Amino acid sequence: DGNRDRSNNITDSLANRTLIVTTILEEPYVMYRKSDKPLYGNDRFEGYCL
Hints:
Elements: E1 31-32, E2 45-46
Antiparallel strand pairs: 1-2
Family: Belongs to the glutamate-gated ion channel (TC 1.A.10.1) family.
Protein name: Glutamate receptor
Subcellular location: Postsynaptic cell membrane
C-alpha cells in the first residue's frame, strides 16, 4: 500500500491537549489587568501574546 496521504483543512486531533507556553513581562505584550480583586486562572494577564 502506497497510503492515501490525507491532508486536512484543520490539522488538530480534536484539541485535547493543553499547550505549555512560557512568557515574560513586557509592554504591551504582557501585563496585569487593571483590577483591585485577586487574580486567578489563565486570565491574570492581557496583551498581544494572549
